[PDB]
């Protein structure tokens, strides 16, 4: 085509063709999901190896106290973005002696991804990132994008087979608010095990969990962690 | 013809710039927004395609405080409009630090049509794709209200309307007797226009996002109370039978 | 901005944008200039396309110094950039040398900005061919330069429109030992050689450079030399 | 114009077999006249380590902010908690890193190494360092160092053993050495703030002092 | 700026059960000469802080646009975030350590008040970006004057009420009026508490000449 | 349009860059290297490919140390990897001065990646690379968590591996690895299985001259093996 | 702070104090005064100490890098002359320092002395120091070329004894150490009491 | 054509910029036509007020535009270049101004116009 | 600036620009390099010289520093460059360490310069 | 120099003297130093003659390009706020104090005052300069609220002549100023014209 190859050239119908493949990068990163009760957010993440000899690919960052990051994409422009948010986090300590909020932190990262979606010759990073945050209105689930835009979600499903987990997550909408940090997280493990195909199962290798809230860090599980978590799990009804 | 299409920096045979109709698609693609200054403000609404239920109440915001006294109404991209808010909120602290008072709207339409149309000059930045509304009340000039397009023409209104159905509801705004009428009722007359343009077949059911700027804030932009919205949208709704 | 150069070799070796600003020049109008045994007269056509331009409003001859006039043929905007930088360049030299600028200096000076206007990235050659006169050393100069940025000393030359016509005239009607009179009405000939209806003190610009300096003839000099000639 | 201010104040550490204490006085001031009688010195940096500083009121607030914020860059770099040595060099780095600017502060940084063991580490202005069993910083440095000396490093001493320091042993003693410095240090008083970094983590306690 | 040409003399503040009080004069001396006597140095950041000074009055206008910069940037996101005293504390040490290290400071030395989540606030930040909170503080002449009498109350009575704080900064400054020759009898004071930031204007206090008599 | 007129940073329909793709193809053209970590230490084993007989085998350098502690394993292009092992180096060498103190080999795994993706033509300044490096690095060391090794590849993606094989026969190689493979394994047990894996994937024969051989373990630097004692160990195999 | 190096037939002897002032206070008494660049170098340190700490932890860093890119050991001559060269840039805003470098390299044992002034002079015989001049006057009459290595470890440690007893700026512990042909050893770090008891 | 002549302003064979003609072709776009006349003792400007929506506010829909006090301007073409001609025409008249200490003169300031359009 | 990359990835990884290179290499006189035990040989090809033409003027043979010498097979000029660029390093190395150059210090270096030849827009 | 505002209902009135001096040596004894700003904006300066002439000229040039592009009168306010940014950023090379005065129709007769420093204040009356500070008591005992434009004119040559006969720094003559409704009145008081004192001893 034409008008795919530079995110400044207009498409006849008003649409920008590189920043949506900007967002068939994010879909082709693996599951994770963002869901917030009345005092904890929680992202559950699905870990990926890329062979049995290698370890399974890190997906959650964690960034402060009070925010932590879940990735779906690419790792390399994650990393970038979540150090860029790291050090506006120090410098908001720094500063002004405080934890930075993350509504403005969200609308500082759209900011920063406007600008590659306007200027010649610039990609968009590709990933999607999905949001644990806190502050004194309450706990958050945010996403960002690639297209600069930034959505705040009850609870939200990224990645790779992630419809499935957002079925999960509306059906049972209501519940959430109401839901204890264990059922939150029960939750959110049954939805990312929604993602995942029917001949696969959770398993402590590939789940990754980062719980933010009241009197708790940003806490990141993982392998053995996540094994008292996936207790509890029933199994797959047929 | 080829390659006369593809930059904003170059014209058609016609004379025509494509990148700017483009970006003029892009607005016509979006949600209806509409905004009416009458004798004592400026009151704007703003249809907000619900189209995900998992998104919180308060997301996917279209109405902003440009300034304490400035209100502001996007259609389009939100990205871009995001941008072009906080260029003008800069440019509204920059004329506080240089001159130590209230900016006038048409001196920040004219701004903001300035930093607008400055990327539609060359090949190497693309025209933003989304049309805006600025509005604010002051004692001295009184209600003034203005549009600029992704061309960066700034044109003075009484009211206007853009997005999807910009000429249903503009057409509406036409059957108005409006320079007398009060701000209570310019919000339910929006209310009950924007349900009007809104189509329920083509595309999900909405939020009706609304603020105003005027002598009952004293000059103050800020969102409709939640009681006046509710009465607004049941006047809406009670039209609608 | 453009670092990329607009002129550029073909693969025949030459430089077309070049040959397309000589074109450009060969639609330009004409510009006679001959230089006598004391100075040197510059003759153009000054045709309106209409009769509402104020013609003494915008002129084609002017001084660069007291002692230095200059004409076109070509780009009329491009013209008047040369003339600004040949009248800063001017008074550079007498900033440094507080003596009159030599014409063949200002000449070698503009002609090296023209040079690099046709190898810059980003930038285009100048549609022009100047003709320029002057007085130094108790000498008249009058010298061409081109858009590939060479200039060439002349005693009599024409260009512009029928510039060929123009050339073969004054190689059949110049004479070393011209006065600056018969200079000025070989040059006027030399303009009706290629102008297209009534000659009017209007509708041509004429000045000359001799011992006293570079000046314009005013109009009632350029209707009583019409008068003489016709 | 000056840029520096001496607002006064005592510290002091001492390291253990398995602990270490660091103590400050709680007297801010200038001149002949008090700020406040209430600014403990002696400030959180990790788990097992604690920062004390005296000197200019204000370097010491801009060298907290910036070590804190250097705790927490590797924090996220290295995926792990300082070691002792590193926060030395760390502190000794960025002392130098300004020679011709330098922070108007005196030192001493109180914890555990990677053994467990007590370790206090003793700075200039200027970025020099050492490892020290004990260290006292500040104005009334020089008056309660041979106090340690000889009773905790046995110096001018004859045919004792060199018994090993016990906790009680190292608070009396920084007891009774701040309660001479309230005494004759004219920047001390008020109050006494002294925790205690053992392998459970780190203790606090304070005690009043003189008023005047 | 490295000479302060018009300063402003000596600010109160003291804590009270709900609150803080802050009180300061409007006189701006011209050096020695009492040049202007009606210029506000206590003004309102917010509902819950507000700030007076001592020293330069250019540099403090200065701090006066930028801190209602900052602060008409923090309302007008919308998200429902404040500025909190001790967040708008940290930002004045900030700015005044950045001014102190490049050898150009502002003159001015800073009493901030603050009441937010049931709790009162009371900073100090001087000229070199000194900063340590207090529940009683006074600069310049007042900082040798009216905090030994506030320290004097505080020792007995750690816990006051407003009409207590108020009788105590008033009787200050007509310690502060009867001995700094900077000072004039034309006060404002105003007071930060859960209902806001209020400022009183016109207030002098009385005067006792009777000790001219027994010579 | 032909391939050549799209970016270096224009996406694939998938997502990707097609520059690291060709460096992950790229990747496919180099020498086969392995690394194996044990409890006892991480061994390393690349082959030189000697092409000539009047090439220096000695000049054929495969296996770096990029400090007392740390070495490398190498696939692909060898001028780039030159400057990655010298930023790996450097930035030891930092971390030892400011800190005074080694830093983790995955510290440098991160701080050899982060360059990785760090090209572009557009706004680049002074300094700047206008294609990905075609390399890709196996980091075994020991630190305060044991014997370590990861791999590094041009995407910037690392990962820590038990037994990781790169380079023309790194997927043959790999299922080798998996079938020799145990978390019991000793130092010895991975150099000699390792040594196999390299003579069975090798066009030519196992000799001492054509092969590298590094180990690094717990209370020991790094080690070059020499020419003798790489012929006794192929003594046994 | 009085340290002293001298060449011989078995090597260099390096000898250095341990006391460091603040002013006229005492700061310490086991401050090492000798840095260990590598196990074939070592640097003394003399004067500002943050100045000598810093600067020789720098050459530590460089001389670690080229042994990195060169796979070859420094010798003493070019880590002198670099030194020389990260110090002439700071030349004249304050650096107060003056160092040996000591070691042993492919020309065999090898001793520089560097300052803050850019002096960068080649000698068999050195010491730096307030005290330099009393150690100065001892190791002139004790030095030979033809010493043995207990000799040699004795007139070094008598000469830093007298420095001590007759400079205030110097005392403390007196720190002893021998570069050969396989590197440097630390041979002894006696107490000076101990020495004034043992040569009374 | 030769190259991108129709895209950019380079030459033709013929030697002409198509991005001129195209500048020329984009005049008219607007749909209004300008006249101004010179009197004896006076100069008028006469150009098309075009309001078809009565919501437009007819005090901003104007083409009539104002440099200084004594010179005045009509504009023909889109309202953004426009706006933009006109701001710089006042920037240059007010930097003449500061300048030589003086109101420009109309031939001077539309020399350095067309000397920007240059 | 001209910031336009010469030498890009093909679809098979090769870089075309550098095989062109080699190319010109190859068209370029024979030069053979032998080590012998205190001695080292060099030996170029001499092209047919013409009648006129001095032979000084096209040695391709040339010190880099006092110790270290050269030859060379492909263009004049651009050898030209590679020995002036040797020639100034070896001349900063003395003056920042006051030792000679060694044979594989200058080597990396001129080849760590024709390798950022191949890493860079606009060359 | 000696240069003074008062403000009354319907605008504003300022006064100045014409001595110019460097060091001990009349420079100028017919100097203007009501500056005018815009046409109905004027500006009183003393101090550093190069310093206020350069501040007032880029004052000037600003305010008439802000005039243009917003094409409405300059407010004093937005004037004075000119001059306080103006003289706040510069602070430490200037010597200037600057007493502006105008009217505009959002809010009548406005006095704002620019000192040393760069503050800004509105006050009813303005006294600056060198012959300021010898009738501050006079000008804190002869002023009332209300005050008519001829009176204030009355007041404004009084207290000039005062601080002509005081001061040495100020000399020349007597120049004023009115600013109201109707525009810009300028007057020159010389010689008689001059209100004497009675200095009887």
């Known amino acids: 085509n034409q008008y795919d190859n530079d995110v400044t050239v207009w498409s006849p119908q008003g649409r920008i063709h590189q920043i949506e493949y900007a967002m068939e990068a994010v879909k082709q990163g693996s599951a994770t999901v963002g869901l917030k009760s009345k005092t904890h957010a929680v992202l559950v993440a699905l870990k990926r190896a890329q062979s049995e000899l290698a370890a399974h690919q890190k997906k959650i960052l964690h960034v402060d106290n009070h925010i932590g990051i879940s990735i779906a994409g690419l790792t390399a422009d994650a990393r970038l973005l979540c150090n860029f948010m790291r050090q506006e986090c120090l410098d908001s300590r720094f500063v002004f002696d405080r934890p930075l909020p993350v509504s403005r932190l969200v609308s500082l990262i759209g900011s920063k991804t406007q600008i590659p979606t306007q200027r010649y010759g610039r990609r968009p990073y590709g990933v999607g990132l999905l949001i644990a945050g806190y502050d004194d209105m309450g706990p958050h689930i945010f996403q960002t994008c690639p297209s600069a835009n930034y959505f705040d979600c009850r609870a939200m499903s990224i990645g790779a087979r992630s419809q499935s987990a957002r079925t999960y997550l509306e059906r049972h909408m209501s519940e959430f608010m109401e839901c204890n940090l264990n059922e939150l997280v029960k939750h959110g493990l049954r939805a990312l095990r929604e993602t995942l195909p029917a001949e696969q199962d959770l398993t402590t290798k590939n789940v990754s969990i980062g719980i933010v809230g009241k009197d708790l860090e940003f806490t990141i599980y993982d392998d053995d962690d996540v094994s008292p978590f996936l207790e509890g799990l029933e199994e797959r009804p047929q | 013809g080829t390659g006369y299409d593809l930059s904003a920096s170059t014209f058609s045979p016609d004379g025509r710039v494509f990148q700017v109709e483009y970006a003029m698609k892009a607005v016509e693609n979006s949600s209806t927004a509409i905004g009416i200054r009458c004798k004592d403000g400026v009151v704007f609404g703003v249809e907000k395609l619900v189209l995900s239920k998992l998104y919180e109440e308060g997301s996917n915001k279209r109405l902003f405080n440009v300034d304490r006294h400035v209100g502001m109404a996007v259609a389009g991209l939100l990205a871009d409009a995001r941008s072009l808010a906080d260029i003008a909120r800069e440019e509204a602290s920059n004329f506080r630090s240089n001159f130590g008072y209230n900016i006038p709207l048409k001196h920040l339409a004219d701004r903001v049509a300035m930093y607008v149309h400055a990327y539609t000059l060359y090949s190497a930045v693309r025209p933003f794709g989304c049309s805006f509304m600025l509005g604010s009340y002051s004692v001295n000039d009184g209600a003034q209200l203005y549009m600029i397009d992704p061309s960066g023409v700034s044109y003075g209104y009484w009211g206007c309307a853009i997005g999807k159905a910009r000429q249903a509801a503009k057409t509406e705004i036409e059957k108005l007797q409006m320079k007398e009428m009060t701000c209570r009722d310019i919000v339910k007359e929006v209310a009950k226009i924007i349900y009007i343009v809104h189509d329920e077949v083509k595309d999900k059911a909405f939020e009706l996002e609304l603020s105003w700027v005027g002598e009952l804030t004293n000059g103050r932009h800020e969102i409709v109370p939640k009681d006046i919205r509710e009465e607004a949208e049941k006047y809406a709704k009670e039209s609608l039978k | 901005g453009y670092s990329f150069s607009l002129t550029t070799f073909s693969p025949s070796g030459k430089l077309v944008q070049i040959e397309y600003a000589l074109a450009a020049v060969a639609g330009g109008a004409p510009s006679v200039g001959i230089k006598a045994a004391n100075g040197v007269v510059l003759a153009t056509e000054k045709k309106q396309k209409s009769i509402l331009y104020d013609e003494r409003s915008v002129h084609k001859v002017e001084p660069i110094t007291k002692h230095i006039g200059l004409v076109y043929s070509g780009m009329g905007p491009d013209y008047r950039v040369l003339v600004h930088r040949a009248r800063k360049l001017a008074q550079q030299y007498y900033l440094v040398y507080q003596e009159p600028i030599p014409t063949a200096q200002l000449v070698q000076r503009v002609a090296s900005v023209m040079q690099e206007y046709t190898q810059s990235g980003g930038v285009r050659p100048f549609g022009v061919s100047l003709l320029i006169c002057g007085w130094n050393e108790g000498r008249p100069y009058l010298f061409q330069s081109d858009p590939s940025g060479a200039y060439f000393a002349w005693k009599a030359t024409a260009m512009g429109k029928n510039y060929v016509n123009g050339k073969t005239f004054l190689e059949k009607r110049y004479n070393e030992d011209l006065e600056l009179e018969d200079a000025i009405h070989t040059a006027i000939l030399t303009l009706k050689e290629s102008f297209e209806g009534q000659m009017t003190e209007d509708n041509i610009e004429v000045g000359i450079c001799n011992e006293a300096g570079f000046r314009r003839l005013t109009p009632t000099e350029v209707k009583d030399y019409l008068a003489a000639i016709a | ?212 | 700026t490295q000479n302060p040409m018009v300063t402003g003399t000596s600010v109160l503040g003291v804590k009270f059960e709900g609150g803080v009080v802050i009180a300061a004069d409007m006189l701006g001396s011209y050096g020695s000469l009492a040049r202007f006597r009606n210029i506000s140095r206590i003004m309102r950041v917010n509902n819950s802080t507000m700030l007076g000074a001592s020293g330069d009055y250019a540099d403090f206008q200065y701090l006066k646009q930028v801190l209602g910069q900052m602060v008409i940037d923090e309302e007008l996101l919308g998200d429902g975030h404040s500025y909190s005293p001790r967040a708008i504390h940290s930002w004045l040490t900030r700015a005044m350590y950045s001014r102190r290290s490049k050898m150009n400071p502002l003159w001015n030395t800073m009493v901030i008040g603050g009441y937010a989540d049931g709790e009162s606030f009371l900073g100090y930040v001087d000229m070199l970006g000194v900063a340590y909170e207090a529940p009683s503080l006074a600069t310049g002449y007042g900082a040798y004057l009216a905090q030994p009498l506030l320290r004097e109350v505080l020792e007995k009575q750690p816990v006051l009420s407003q009409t207590e704080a108020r009788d105590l900064v008033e009787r200050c400054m007509r310690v502060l009026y009867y001995r700094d020759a900077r000072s004039y009898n034309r006060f404002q004071i105003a007071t930060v508490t859960e209902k806001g930031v209020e400022i009183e204007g016109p207030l002098s206090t009385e005067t006792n000449w009777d000790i001219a008599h027994m010579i | 349009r032909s391939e050549y007129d799209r970016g270096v940073n224009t996406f694939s329909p998938e997502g990707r860059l097609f520059q690291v793709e060709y460096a992950i193809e790229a990747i496919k053209l180099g020498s086969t290297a392995i690394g194996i970590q044990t409890s006892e230490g991480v061994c390393l084993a690349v082959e030189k490919r000697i092409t000539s007989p009047l090439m220096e085998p000695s000049s054929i350098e495969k296996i770096v140390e990029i400090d007392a502690h740390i070495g490398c394993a190498m696939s692909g292009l060898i001028a780039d990897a030159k400057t990655l092992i010298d930023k790996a180096r450097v930035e030891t060498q930092n971390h030892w001065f400011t800190y005074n103190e080694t830093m983790t080999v995955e510290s440098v795994t991160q701080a050899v990646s982060n360059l990785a993706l760090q090209f572009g033509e557009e706004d680049a300044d002074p300094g700047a690379m206008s294609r990905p490096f075609g390399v890709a690095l196996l980091f075994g060391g020991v630190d305060e968590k044991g014997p370590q090794l990861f791999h590094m590849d041009p995407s910037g993606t690392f990962v820590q591996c038990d037994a990781r094989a790169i380079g023309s026969a790194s997927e043959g190689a790999q299922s080798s690895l998996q079938e020799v493979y145990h978390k019991s394994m000793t130092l010895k047990e991975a150099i000699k299985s390792s040594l196999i894996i390299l003579k069975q994937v090798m066009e030519e024969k196992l000799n001492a001259t054509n092969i590298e051989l590094a180990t690094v373990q717990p209370g020991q630097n790094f080690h070059m093996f020499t020419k003798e004692e790489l012929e006794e160990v192929i003594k046994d195999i | 702070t009085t340290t002293l190096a001298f060449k011989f037939r078995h090597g260099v002897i390096v000898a250095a104090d341990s006391r460091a002032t603040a002013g006229a206070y005492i700061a310490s008494q086991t401050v090492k005064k000798v840095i260990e660049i590598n196990p074939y170098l070592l640097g003394t340190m003399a004067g500002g100490a943050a100045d000598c700490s810093f600067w020789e932890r720098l050459l530590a860093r460089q001389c670690r890098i080229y042994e990195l890119r060169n796979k070859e050991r420094i010798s003493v001559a070019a880590a002198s002359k670099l030194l020389a060269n990260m110090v002439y840039q700071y030349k004249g805003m304050g650096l107060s320092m003056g160092t040996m470098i000591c070691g042993w390299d492919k020309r065999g044992p090898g001793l520089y002395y560097v300052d803050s002034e850019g002096n960068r002079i080649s000698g068999a015989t050195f010491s730096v120091g307030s005290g330099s001049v009393y150690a100065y006057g001892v190791m002139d009459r004790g030095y030979s070329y033809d010493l043995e290595v207990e000799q040699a470890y004795d007139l070094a440690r008598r000469a830093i004894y007298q420095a001590t007893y007759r400079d205030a700026y110097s005392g403390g512990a007196v720190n002893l150490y021998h570069v050969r042909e396989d590197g440097w050893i630390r041979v002894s770090s006696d107490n000076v009491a101990d020495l004034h008891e043992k040569y009374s | 054509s030769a190259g991108f002549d129709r895209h950019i302003t380079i030459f033709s064979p013929e030697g002409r910029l198509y991005q001129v003609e195209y500048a020329f072709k984009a005049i008219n776009q607007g749909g209004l036509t300008s006249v101004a006349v010179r009197g004896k003792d006076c100069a008028v400007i006469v150009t098309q007020k075009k309001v078809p929506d009565k919501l437009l506010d007819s005090s901003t829909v104007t083409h009539l535009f104002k440099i200084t006090e004594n010179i005045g301007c009509v504009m023909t073409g889109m309202t953004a270049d426009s706006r933009s001609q006109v701001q710089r025409a006042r920037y240059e008249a007010a930097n003449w101004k500061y300048k030589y200490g003086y109101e420009i003169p109309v031939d001077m300031l539309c020399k350095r116009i067309a000397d920007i359009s240059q | 600036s001209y910031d336009r990359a010469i030498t890009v990835f093909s679809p098979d990884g090769h870089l075309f620009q550098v095989e062109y290179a080699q190319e010109a290499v190859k068209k370029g006189s024979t030069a053979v390099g032998v080590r012998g035990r205190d001695i080292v040989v060099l030996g170029v090809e001499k092209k047919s010289v013409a009648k006129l033409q001095d032979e000084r003027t096209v040695r391709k043979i040339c010190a880099l520093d006092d110790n270290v010498c050269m030859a060379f097979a492909g263009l004049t000029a651009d050898a030209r460059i590679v020995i002036n660029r040797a020639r100034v390093e070896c001349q900063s190395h003395r003056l920042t360490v006051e030792d000679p150059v060694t044979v594989e210090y200058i080597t990396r270096y001129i080849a760590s310069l024709k390798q950022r030849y191949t890493q860079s827009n606009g060359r | 120099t000696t240069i003074m505002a008062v403000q009354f209902d319907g605008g504003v009135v300022l006064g100045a003297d014409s001595r110019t001096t460097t060091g001990s040596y009349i420079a100028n004894r017919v100097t203007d130093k009501l500056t005018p700003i815009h046409d109905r904006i004027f500006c009183c300066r003393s101090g550093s003659a190069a310093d206020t002439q350069a501040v007032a000229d880029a004052v000037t040039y600003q305010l008439g390009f802000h005039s243009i592009e917003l094409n409405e009168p300059p407010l004093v306010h937005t004037a004075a706020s000119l001059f306080k940014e103006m003289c706040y950023r510069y602070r430490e090379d200037l010597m200037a104090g600057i007493i502006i005065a105008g009217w505009d129709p959002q809010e009548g007769g406005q006095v704002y005052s620019v000192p040393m420093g760069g503050m800004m204040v509105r006050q009813s009356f303005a006294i600056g300069g060198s012959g300021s500070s010898y009738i501050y008591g006079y000008v804190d005992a002869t002023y009332r609220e209300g005050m008519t434009k001829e009176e204030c004119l009355q007041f404004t040559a009084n207290a000039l002549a005062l601080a002509m006969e005081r001061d040495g720094s100020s000399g020349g003559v007597i120049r004023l100023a009115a600013i109201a409704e109707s525009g810009v009145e300028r007057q020159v008081l010389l010689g008689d014209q001059i209100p004497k004192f009675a200095v009887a001893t």
């Open chain 4, 1 to 212: 114009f000056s840029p520096y201010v001496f607002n006064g104040g005592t510290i002091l550490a001492i390291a253990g077999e398995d602990f270490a204490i660091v103590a400050s006085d709680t007297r801010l001031s200038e001149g002949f006249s008090i700020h406040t009688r209430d600014s403990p010195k002696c400030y959180k940096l990790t788990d097992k380590t604690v920062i004390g500083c005296s000197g200019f009121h204000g370097d010491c607030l801009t060298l907290t902010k910036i070590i804190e914020a250097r705790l927490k860059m590797y924090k996220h770099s290295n995926n792990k908690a300082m070691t002792t040595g590193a926060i030395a060099a760390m502190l000794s780095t960025i002392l130098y890193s300004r020679r011709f600017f330098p922070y108007y502060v005196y030192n001493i940084i109180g914890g555990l190494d990677e053994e467990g063991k007590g370790a206090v580490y003793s700075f200039d202005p200027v970025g020099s360092y050492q490892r020290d069993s004990f260290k006292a910083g500040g104005s009334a440095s020089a008056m309660l160092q041979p106090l340690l000396d000889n009773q905790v490093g046995f110096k001018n001493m004859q045919n004792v053993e060199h018994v090993p320091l016990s906790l009680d042993r190292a608070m009396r003693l920084v007891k009774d050495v701040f309660i001479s410095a309230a005494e004759r240090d004219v920047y001390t008083g008020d109050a006494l703030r002294i925790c205690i970094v053992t392998k459970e983590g780190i203790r606090e306690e304070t005690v009043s002092l003189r008023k005047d």
